[PDB]
């Protein structure tokens, strides 16, 4: 019951702030590691 409420709050908070987190993570990876964000569909 308590865990259910905690997980519901966490799921709402996680889903409500997805695009910004994804874009910020992409920015961090682009600025720190490398600048060729083509890991997917590579090696062909």
């Amino acid at each position: 019951n308590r865990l259910e409420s905690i997980l519901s709050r966490f799921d709402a908070d996680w889903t409500a702030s997805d695009e910004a987190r994804r874009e910020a993570k992409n920015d961090l990876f682009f600025s720190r590691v490398s600048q060729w964000d083509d890991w997917l569909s590579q090696y062909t």
Binding site: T15, A16, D18, E19
Partner: protein, 48 residues
Amino acid sequence: ADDIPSFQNPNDWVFPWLTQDTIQIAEFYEVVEKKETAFIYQDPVTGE
């Protein structure tokens, strides 16, 4: 908290956003002038 309020939707679905709150309530402010009454007293400390 058992009934879900609703109102006009200010925002728009114009982006690939995942979810929305979809819970909107409104507040209404108004101002009136009625010329209400007032009381005049005498201050115990000073005669004013």
